[PDB]
Amino acid sequence: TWLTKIVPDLRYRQTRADFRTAGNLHRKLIRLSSDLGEERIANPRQQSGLLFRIEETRNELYLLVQSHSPLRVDRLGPGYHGVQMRNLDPFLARLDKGSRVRYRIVASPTKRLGRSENNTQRLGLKRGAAAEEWWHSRAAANGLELLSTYAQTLDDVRDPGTADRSRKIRHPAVRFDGEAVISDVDAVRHAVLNGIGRGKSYGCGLLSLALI
Amino acid sequence: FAHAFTVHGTTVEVDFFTAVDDIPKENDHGSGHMNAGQFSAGTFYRYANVNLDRLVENTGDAQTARTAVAEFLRAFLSTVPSGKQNATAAMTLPDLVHIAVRFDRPISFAPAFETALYGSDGYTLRACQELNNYAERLREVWPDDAIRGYATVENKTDLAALGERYDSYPALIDAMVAAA
Amino acid sequence: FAHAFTVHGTTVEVDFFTAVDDIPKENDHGSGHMNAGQFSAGTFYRYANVNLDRLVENTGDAQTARTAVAEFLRAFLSTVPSGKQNATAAMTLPDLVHIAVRFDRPISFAPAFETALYGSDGYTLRACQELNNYAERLREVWPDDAIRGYATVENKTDLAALGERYDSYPALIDAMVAAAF
RNA sequence: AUGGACCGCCAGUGAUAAGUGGAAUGCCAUGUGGGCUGUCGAGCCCCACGCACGUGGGG
């Protein structure tokens, strides 16, 4: 995998595209990668596949893509290929186990339930914590972290009209931030490259580390 | 001789002032006099023409005339009036000097400074390079066989259309009065 | 004598001050007064010219004139006003002193400071070296046989165009008034 | 189609030459912004595995 910083702007002066919706946003994220491979197995985490992090949404969007395919500049983008681009190996200095490395993990804590007049549904809420248990339970014995659970709202997603393109729903995303402790190198490595959680096309999953 | 106007819109600045008086009568802080004098700062543009023909006619000779025009240009750059100077030393030298010798008609660069310049930045560089641009397009629109030279107190930009950059004001004046 | 303006754009900051009463009544804790005095800091540039000829004309003698100009210069550097100084001690010394003796016309370096200076860094060094550059180009554009000397409270840069760096303010003033007769 | 019908006041012109508003000036003396404080379940759809408690994948 490798890392790049990008900033997408609105096509015209009437916000016809792209920031108007989330489906076009991820559309602008897949368009940049023409060639795409996709290998699946019975319910593991997906590795196809891109990862991105939205920092701020007040200047059309500030975004950071970490992925495997090379990102290519398109219409109404930065004044260069980037903002910035470089390769990165989770092999550098091996990311020594037992050594501390900072991190920034997005998430979407959920628990699934049977709902009346359903057609079972998943629910973003799982008094005294439950999301700590949820993420450190999914967070198998690799780099353990801290759990910064929040208590607010909200994220929406609607369709621009294209077929086979998700419609309108909401989803909460918790922004955990801290200093990962590495207890397993290949497990945290493969877990970062895959992406942590479902809906990798909506921002969740991306993990970035740092040094002491 | 032309009037000197700023190259950018300037409003007047009121300066409240007071004349404290010694010998206190009531130990009050009461001062002998108060007022408000108007002042203003800015980057003035100045221009002047010397009709050699009529000057040689008035002086009669051609040698006396050359001395009068050389001293005229040097006094034009050096001098500054004496109006409200004892309270604000506004003695200065022109940041840009462009002498041109034209054999057909005199020309002013006033229209270049019609669109006022908005600021928050400096005005010396902007005024210099803008006068340059106007002298270039103006030179390629009214072609003429003239001599052009200029001195400048800023080595940042290169003013091409203003001629050959002489080294100093008196040198420029000597080479230009000579070419006259 | 010229007005002293900053070399960098400064906005005014509104100081909210309160006057508390040292004796309390029940049902209230209001202070004795409440206002907002304006204040501002910055690096001021200052300049002054002394027409020796006319001063010797007023005084008549030349020795009294020399004493008056020497004490004038020392008072110009030394003093600082007494305006709102008791509550905000702003007693300071000039970070750069440049005396020049000109025999043709006095000249100020104000245009050097027309282009305002943006900051987030210091302003003493930038103002000093920028004044240097302007004195250099101005010296090579209006050539003249004049005397130049300067003292400075910062030994980092070497200001060439400002003359021969004397050691201290009173020494500089003495040698310049001496050279000016 | 009217005391009307048709019907040009009109062909030429420098307002001109000359001029400092100028000398003088602390806006000043006095001020707390203060007392109080843990950030710890309805969400739309598909598919896969499921001990029918749920778990993960793509929108």
XYZ file of C-alpha atoms (C1' of nucleotides) in Angstrom:
632
model
C 0.000 0.000 0.000
C 0.941 3.680 -0.233
C -0.300 7.114 0.824
C -1.526 10.271 -0.896
C -3.274 13.499 0.099
C -6.007 14.854 -2.180
C -8.641 17.587 -2.118
C -11.678 17.292 -4.427
C -13.645 20.396 -5.375
C -17.112 20.923 -6.785
C -17.283 20.624 -10.574
C -19.174 23.847 -11.287
C -20.489 26.869 -9.367
C -23.867 25.178 -8.696
C -22.520 22.132 -6.761
C -23.789 19.842 -9.513
C -20.969 17.443 -8.562
C -19.399 15.971 -6.605
C -19.732 16.914 -2.945
C -23.533 17.110 -3.294
C -23.783 13.456 -2.183
C -21.734 10.576 -0.836
C -22.388 8.182 -3.723
C -20.768 10.559 -6.167
C -17.966 11.118 -3.663
C -16.969 7.456 -3.568
C -17.625 7.432 -7.312
C -14.898 10.060 -7.668
C -12.766 7.786 -5.478
C -13.121 4.700 -7.693
C -12.884 6.588 -11.007
C -9.274 7.533 -10.214
C -8.343 3.832 -10.186
C -9.168 2.303 -13.570
C -7.762 -1.196 -13.083
C -9.339 -2.947 -10.095
C -8.879 -6.489 -8.831
C -11.428 -8.128 -6.551
C -10.887 -11.496 -4.856
C -13.420 -12.637 -2.273
C -13.699 -15.448 0.264
C -16.606 -16.555 2.442
C -16.895 -13.511 4.809
C -13.308 -12.289 5.508
C -12.490 -8.584 5.391
C -12.196 -7.089 1.912
C -8.882 -6.299 0.180
C -9.730 -4.938 -3.287
C -9.653 -2.000 -2.533
C -9.075 1.593 -1.440
C -9.028 3.445 1.885
C -9.571 7.150 2.564
C -10.007 9.544 5.503
C -12.005 12.777 5.503
C -10.394 15.344 7.795
C -12.519 18.476 7.256
C -15.614 19.149 5.137
C -15.568 22.951 5.016
C -13.367 23.462 1.930
C -15.278 21.208 -0.473
C -13.520 18.294 1.399
C -10.025 17.449 2.710
C -9.207 13.806 2.020
C -6.362 11.279 2.449
C -6.305 8.134 0.251
C -4.118 5.177 1.237
C -4.413 2.300 -1.220
C -2.589 -0.019 -3.629
C -3.505 1.300 -7.044
C -1.861 4.555 -8.173
C -4.163 7.541 -7.797
C -4.401 9.744 -10.892
C -5.419 13.400 -10.980
C -8.652 14.199 -12.809
C -10.831 17.192 -13.661
C -11.195 19.949 -11.033
C -8.491 18.650 -8.716
C -5.260 19.925 -7.160
C -2.746 21.878 -9.181
C -0.618 18.725 -9.360
C -0.875 14.933 -9.222
C -1.362 14.962 -5.446
C -1.773 16.951 -3.162
C 0.988 14.494 -2.155
C 2.000 10.948 -3.068
C 4.511 8.412 -1.783
C 4.851 4.714 -1.062
C 4.877 3.178 2.395
C 5.768 -0.277 3.633
C 4.439 -1.709 6.918
C 7.745 -3.576 6.791
C 9.855 -0.465 7.515
C 11.828 -1.131 10.709
C 9.389 -4.062 10.836
C 7.069 -1.877 12.937
C 8.681 -3.712 15.860
C 6.320 -5.582 18.160
C 6.049 -4.294 21.709
C 7.026 -0.802 20.536
C 4.483 1.994 20.576
C 3.191 3.580 17.363
C 0.428 6.176 17.337
C -2.786 5.670 15.410
C -6.030 7.166 14.157
C -8.913 4.707 13.691
C -12.368 5.410 12.350
C -15.209 3.067 13.228
C -18.937 2.336 13.338
C -19.828 0.340 16.467
C -22.884 -1.764 15.805
C -24.925 -4.678 17.066
C -27.530 -6.393 14.939
C -31.038 -7.083 16.136
C -34.396 -8.357 15.002
C -36.805 -5.486 14.518
C -40.571 -5.653 14.391
C -42.106 -5.461 10.892
C -38.685 -6.612 9.646
C -36.431 -7.951 7.894
C -33.794 -7.746 10.650
C -31.646 -4.638 10.993
C -28.270 -3.509 12.316
C -28.093 -0.763 14.957
C -25.214 1.665 15.679
C -25.748 1.398 19.462
C -24.472 -1.669 21.329
C -25.119 3.860 30.946
C -21.596 2.461 31.022
C -19.746 1.671 27.758
C -20.184 -1.150 25.183
C -18.210 0.240 22.236
C -14.961 -0.282 24.084
C -15.898 -3.959 24.351
C -17.028 -4.001 20.715
C -13.857 -2.639 19.145
C -11.383 -4.306 21.469
C -13.319 -7.515 20.814
C -12.940 -7.152 17.049
C -9.421 -5.768 17.684
C -7.849 -9.219 18.125
C -4.475 -9.606 19.853
C -2.563 -7.367 17.467
C -1.885 -3.720 18.159
C -4.199 -2.962 21.054
C -5.428 0.602 21.374
C -7.629 2.902 23.448
C -11.322 3.538 22.854
C -12.596 7.108 22.389
C -16.342 6.578 22.124
C -18.514 9.601 21.318
C -22.217 10.354 21.818
C -23.419 12.434 18.843
C -24.798 12.396 15.283
C -24.847 11.910 12.245
C -23.904 10.877 8.690
C -26.221 10.732 5.660
C -25.939 9.131 2.221
C -28.267 9.565 -0.756
C -28.167 8.516 -4.382
C -27.531 10.763 -7.402
C -29.893 8.558 -9.453
C -27.476 5.997 -10.919
C -28.569 2.365 -10.845
C -26.985 -0.068 -8.361
C -26.007 2.904 -6.179
C -27.041 2.991 -2.488
C -29.997 5.202 -1.637
C -30.590 7.314 1.512
C -29.673 6.177 5.033
C -27.690 7.403 8.030
C -24.690 5.992 9.892
C -22.585 7.007 12.923
C -18.787 6.900 12.873
C -16.597 7.048 15.996
C -13.216 8.774 15.676
C -10.806 6.974 17.963
C -7.344 8.527 18.210
C -4.316 7.468 20.190
C -1.109 5.450 20.419
C -1.368 1.831 19.304
C 0.722 -0.800 21.063
C 1.888 -3.553 18.721
C 1.330 -7.079 20.024
C 1.367 -8.774 16.600
C 3.025 -7.315 13.505
C 1.556 -9.323 10.621
C -1.917 -9.233 12.177
C -1.993 -5.465 12.592
C -0.343 -5.118 9.175
C -2.918 -7.205 7.314
C -5.687 -5.644 9.402
C -4.601 -2.162 8.317
C -4.275 -3.128 4.664
C -7.694 -4.809 4.601
C -9.620 -2.064 6.405
C -11.392 -2.418 9.755
C -15.130 -2.922 9.313
C -17.779 -2.970 6.625
C -18.584 -0.060 4.327
C -14.993 0.739 3.366
C -16.364 2.987 0.615
C -17.862 5.404 3.163
C -14.695 6.340 5.094
C -14.551 3.654 7.785
C -11.605 1.301 8.102
C -8.526 3.469 7.517
C -5.762 3.213 10.130
C -2.645 5.379 10.218
C 0.243 4.848 12.654
C 3.105 7.034 13.854
C 6.410 6.832 15.711
C 7.263 7.809 19.293
C 4.824 71.749 -14.731
C 2.161 69.245 -13.648
C 0.226 68.737 -10.440
C 1.287 65.736 -8.357
C -1.519 63.310 -7.511
C -1.357 60.046 -5.606
C -1.494 56.799 -7.523
C -4.036 55.470 -5.028
C -7.075 56.907 -3.298
C -6.179 58.475 0.033
C -8.543 59.916 2.624
C -7.488 62.649 5.008
C -6.220 61.822 8.474
C -7.303 64.112 11.287
C -4.604 64.578 13.926
C -5.886 65.859 17.242
C -3.234 67.976 18.908
C -2.694 69.984 22.050
C -0.477 72.819 23.265
C 0.290 72.250 26.943
C 0.973 75.412 28.939
C 3.414 75.688 31.823
C 2.676 77.641 34.999
C -0.343 75.687 36.281
C -3.071 77.845 37.819
C -5.412 75.238 39.343
C -3.140 72.167 39.201
C -5.523 70.983 36.501
C -4.404 69.078 33.467
C -6.041 71.858 31.427
C -3.956 72.715 28.390
C -3.560 76.081 26.712
C -4.923 74.894 23.392
C -6.436 72.016 21.452
C -7.171 71.489 17.747
C -7.138 68.939 14.943
C -4.767 69.357 11.998
C -5.320 67.439 8.774
C -2.471 65.351 7.359
C -2.076 62.649 4.719
C 0.516 60.274 3.277
C 0.904 58.466 -0.007
C 2.945 57.778 -3.119
C 2.761 60.793 -5.412
C 3.369 60.730 -9.147
C 5.002 63.810 -10.664
C 5.637 64.968 -14.215
C 7.092 67.921 -16.094
C 8.007 68.963 -19.646
C 10.702 71.295 -20.941
C 10.057 72.763 -24.407
C 13.665 73.181 -25.534
C 12.801 75.321 -28.570
C 11.105 78.100 -26.619
C 13.727 77.890 -23.898
C 16.571 78.444 -26.364
C 14.517 81.317 -27.723
C 14.151 82.958 -24.310
C 17.754 82.440 -23.220
C 19.000 83.174 -26.723
C 22.182 81.165 -26.362
C 22.410 77.389 -26.502
C 25.037 77.028 -23.764
C 23.133 78.995 -21.122
C 20.019 76.999 -21.972
C 21.767 73.679 -21.365
C 22.855 74.811 -17.923
C 19.345 75.995 -17.099
C 17.725 72.712 -18.137
C 20.307 70.569 -16.349
C 19.863 72.528 -13.148
C 16.122 72.402 -13.676
C 16.013 68.614 -13.741
C 18.345 68.286 -10.755
C 16.289 70.752 -8.754
C 13.123 68.956 -9.770
C 14.335 65.689 -8.324
C 16.107 67.086 -5.263
C 13.648 69.702 -3.971
C 10.489 69.159 -1.875
C 8.291 72.063 -0.629
C 8.535 73.682 2.790
C 4.872 73.474 3.693
C 4.428 71.991 7.160
C 7.859 70.403 7.250
C 9.078 71.671 10.603
C 6.455 69.433 12.215
C 6.844 66.472 9.859
C 10.085 65.896 7.983
C 8.745 64.783 4.617
C 12.088 65.239 2.882
C 12.488 62.406 0.391
C 13.774 61.456 -3.059
C 11.779 60.073 -5.981
C 11.772 56.314 -6.030
C 11.637 56.301 -9.830
C 12.927 58.829 -12.363
C 12.283 58.592 -16.115
C 13.606 61.278 -18.472
C 12.675 60.979 -22.132
C 13.690 63.177 -25.042
C 10.943 63.407 -27.631
C 11.222 65.277 -30.902
C 7.518 65.454 -31.769
C 5.374 66.130 -28.696
C 5.531 65.799 -24.909
C 3.642 62.951 -23.291
C 2.355 62.365 -19.755
C 1.754 59.042 -18.035
C -1.224 60.261 -15.993
C -3.798 57.931 -17.639
C -1.779 54.956 -16.404
C -2.737 55.874 -12.843
C -6.438 56.445 -13.430
C -7.637 53.144 -12.040
C -6.784 53.649 -8.389
C -4.670 50.956 -6.789
C -6.110 49.001 -3.903
C -3.626 48.002 -1.276
C -2.777 46.273 2.002
C 0.458 45.573 0.122
C 3.156 47.952 -0.965
C 2.703 50.595 -3.626
C 6.238 51.270 -4.825
C 6.716 48.036 -6.743
C 3.160 47.978 -8.068
C 3.376 51.590 -9.218
C 6.772 51.076 -10.830
C 5.889 47.952 -12.794
C 2.548 49.403 -13.788
C 4.140 52.545 -15.141
C 6.488 50.258 -17.045
C 3.657 48.277 -18.624
C 1.865 51.448 -19.653
C 5.050 52.866 -21.141
C 5.561 49.684 -23.147
C 2.113 49.406 -24.690
C 2.067 53.169 -25.129
C 5.426 52.925 -26.870
C 4.188 50.273 -29.275
C 1.032 52.247 -30.051
C 2.633 55.659 -30.746
C 5.919 54.684 -32.410
C 8.519 57.418 -32.233
C 12.262 58.022 -32.460
C 13.005 59.069 -28.894
C 15.724 58.500 -26.304
C 14.783 56.923 -22.995
C 16.609 56.455 -19.714
C 15.656 55.941 -16.106
C 17.069 55.498 -12.626
C 15.389 53.545 -9.857
C 15.806 52.986 -6.139
C 14.655 49.344 -6.339
C 16.688 46.508 -7.840
C 13.831 43.983 -7.680
C 12.081 44.368 -11.046
C 13.578 45.176 -14.441
C 11.895 48.098 -16.202
C 12.564 47.497 -19.887
C 10.333 50.002 -21.686
C 11.740 52.910 -19.693
C 14.991 52.734 -21.672
C 18.539 52.030 -20.521
C 18.922 52.006 -16.757
C 21.507 54.610 -15.906
C 23.338 54.303 -12.639
C 22.276 57.456 -10.800
C 20.042 60.520 -11.063
C 22.800 63.026 -11.917
C 24.280 60.583 -14.416
C 20.896 60.082 -16.070
C 20.389 63.846 -16.166
C 23.814 64.406 -17.713
C 23.330 61.780 -20.414
C 19.826 63.021 -21.190
C 20.582 66.745 -21.312
C 23.514 65.787 -23.531
C 21.260 63.860 -25.897
C 19.012 66.933 -26.043
C 10.955 66.337 13.511
C 8.945 63.553 11.900
C 6.081 61.389 13.093
C 6.996 57.876 14.168
C 5.086 55.159 12.351
C 5.443 51.415 12.679
C 7.283 49.334 10.125
C 4.506 46.731 10.160
C 0.728 46.950 10.177
C -0.705 46.798 13.695
C -4.344 46.675 14.731
C -5.454 48.082 18.060
C -6.193 45.711 20.943
C -9.061 46.556 23.294
C -8.004 46.155 26.921
C -10.973 45.547 29.212
C -10.118 46.985 32.616
C -12.150 47.030 35.809
C -11.963 49.178 38.951
C -12.835 47.138 42.050
C -14.074 48.723 45.277
C -12.271 47.473 48.368
C -15.361 47.616 50.647
C -18.175 45.084 50.207
C -21.934 45.421 50.487
C -24.327 42.518 50.442
C -26.480 41.753 47.383
C -23.798 42.981 44.976
C -20.223 42.417 43.856
C -20.148 44.992 41.086
C -16.850 46.732 40.655
C -16.176 50.438 40.974
C -15.954 50.955 37.220
C -15.668 49.106 33.920
C -14.117 50.314 30.666
C -11.865 49.270 27.808
C -8.716 51.306 27.218
C -7.152 50.782 23.815
C -3.518 49.747 23.567
C -0.993 48.722 20.928
C 2.627 47.577 20.636
C 5.091 47.594 17.776
C 8.453 48.625 16.348
C 8.373 52.350 15.629
C 10.675 54.086 13.161
C 11.804 57.625 13.976
C 13.669 60.405 12.151
C 14.810 63.991 12.603
C 16.846 66.573 10.681
C 18.956 69.437 12.036
C 19.646 72.391 9.724
C 23.003 73.412 11.186
C 23.264 76.676 9.228
C 19.961 78.060 10.474
C 20.673 76.824 13.987
C 23.997 78.660 14.101
C 22.045 81.619 12.770
C 19.564 81.495 15.638
C 22.172 80.885 18.341
C 24.672 83.222 16.703
C 27.740 81.505 18.112
C 29.057 78.198 16.819
C 30.082 76.569 20.092
C 26.692 77.046 21.710
C 25.171 75.695 18.513
C 27.399 72.621 18.706
C 26.367 72.017 22.301
C 22.694 72.405 21.449
C 22.829 69.910 18.595
C 24.823 67.394 20.640
C 22.388 67.585 23.548
C 19.500 67.497 21.103
C 20.636 64.238 19.553
C 21.286 62.671 22.941
C 17.828 63.719 24.077
C 16.283 62.379 20.883
C 17.644 58.923 21.539
C 17.380 58.942 25.331
C 13.886 60.286 25.997
C 10.542 58.466 25.708
C 7.242 60.281 26.414
C 5.305 60.147 29.654
C 1.971 59.343 28.089
C 0.216 56.434 29.790
C 3.608 55.236 31.007
C 2.974 55.061 34.732
C 0.643 52.081 34.274
C 2.414 50.554 31.227
C 6.164 50.982 31.605
C 7.413 51.230 28.020
C 10.822 52.782 28.715
C 13.062 51.537 25.921
C 16.137 52.342 23.793
C 16.422 52.564 20.016
C 17.504 49.306 18.462
C 19.269 51.139 15.638
C 20.804 54.596 15.488
C 22.092 56.059 12.221
C 23.366 59.647 12.090
C 24.380 61.023 8.708
C 25.789 64.465 7.969
C 24.651 65.726 4.589
C 25.855 68.925 2.948
C 23.216 69.209 0.210
C 19.788 68.228 1.557
C 18.372 66.087 4.362
C 16.883 62.747 3.415
C 14.554 60.350 5.236
C 14.286 56.584 4.861
C 10.498 56.461 5.235
C 9.859 55.000 1.736
C 11.821 51.933 2.769
C 8.931 51.153 5.103
C 6.063 51.747 2.692
C 5.688 48.095 1.836
C 4.359 46.837 5.141
C 6.146 43.897 6.702
C 4.235 40.705 7.310
C 5.247 38.846 10.410
C 5.002 35.810 12.689
C 8.759 36.387 12.964
C 10.699 39.201 14.502
C 10.758 42.723 13.168
C 14.021 44.175 14.476
C 16.359 42.234 12.211
C 14.151 42.540 9.138
C 13.741 46.279 9.665
C 17.464 46.774 10.234
C 18.680 44.871 7.183
C 15.882 46.285 5.048
C 16.833 49.795 6.083
C 20.359 48.777 5.146
C 19.375 47.753 1.621
C 17.433 50.956 1.118
C 20.374 53.030 2.314
C 22.644 51.138 -0.078
C 20.620 51.605 -3.236
C 19.740 55.135 -2.209
C 23.420 55.861 -1.659
C 24.311 54.612 -5.116
C 21.434 56.487 -6.758
C 21.981 59.928 -5.163
C 25.773 59.927 -4.857
C 27.158 62.416 -2.387
C 30.245 62.958 -0.248
C 28.622 62.653 3.175
C 29.581 61.232 6.569
C 27.855 58.140 7.921
C 27.949 56.380 11.281
C 25.696 54.047 13.184
C 25.329 52.090 16.404
C 23.274 48.942 16.841
C 22.030 46.763 19.684
C 22.317 43.546 17.633
C 25.658 42.062 16.625
C 24.316 39.470 14.181
C 24.359 41.296 10.852
C 26.917 43.832 9.639
C 25.325 46.926 8.108
C 27.816 48.176 5.533
C 25.879 50.980 3.838
C 25.241 52.685 7.185
C 28.884 53.776 7.562
C 31.404 52.860 10.260
C 29.841 51.034 13.197
C 30.739 53.003 16.282
C 30.728 51.316 19.656
C 28.045 53.214 21.584
C 25.356 55.866 21.195
C 27.150 58.724 23.018
C 30.388 57.968 21.189
C 28.573 57.993 17.851
C 26.890 61.280 18.722
C 30.190 62.838 19.775
C 32.072 61.783 16.648
C 29.258 62.875 14.356
C 28.696 66.260 15.966
C 32.476 66.647 15.851
C 32.652 65.842 12.157
C 29.753 68.245 11.576
C 31.519 71.159 13.328
C -58.372 68.556 -46.235
C -58.813 73.793 -40.795
C -56.162 82.365 -42.457
C -54.737 76.411 -43.931
C -51.984 72.806 -48.107
C -45.649 73.289 -49.672
C -42.213 75.034 -45.802
C -34.373 74.384 -42.870
C -32.278 81.379 -39.916
C -27.944 79.890 -41.603
C -23.287 78.938 -43.478
C -17.091 81.208 -38.852
C -14.795 81.201 -34.529
C -8.203 79.354 -28.357
C -10.717 82.679 -23.400
C -6.306 83.814 -23.239
C -1.366 84.505 -21.232
C 0.895 84.656 -13.719
C 0.879 82.881 -9.112
C 3.754 78.744 -1.455
C -1.454 79.073 2.531
C 2.520 80.079 5.666
C 4.742 80.182 10.188
C 3.071 76.976 16.686
C 1.599 73.057 19.437
C 2.042 65.915 25.774
C -4.489 64.479 25.540
C -3.650 63.985 29.762
C -3.442 62.460 35.026
C -6.666 56.439 38.070
C -8.013 51.300 37.777
C -8.870 42.524 39.832
C -13.256 40.607 35.632
C -14.431 38.447 39.172
C -16.049 34.378 42.561
C -18.813 27.674 40.483
C -18.072 23.219 37.808
C -16.419 14.248 35.915
C -18.097 14.254 29.164
C -19.536 9.286 30.737
C -30.328 1.651 21.278
C -35.099 2.403 15.354
C -29.861 2.699 10.784
C -32.092 1.827 4.259
C -30.756 -2.531 1.295
C -28.147 -7.236 -0.557
C -25.307 -11.497 0.337
C -22.320 -15.079 3.271
C -21.748 -17.964 8.353
C -24.493 -18.836 12.193
C -25.290 -22.133 18.637
C -31.903 -17.961 15.921
C -28.005 -14.846 20.954
C -25.745 -12.763 16.602
C -20.857 -12.050 13.184
C -18.474 -10.343 9.114
C -18.483 -8.590 3.063
C -20.216 -5.098 -0.871
C -23.571 -0.491 -1.450
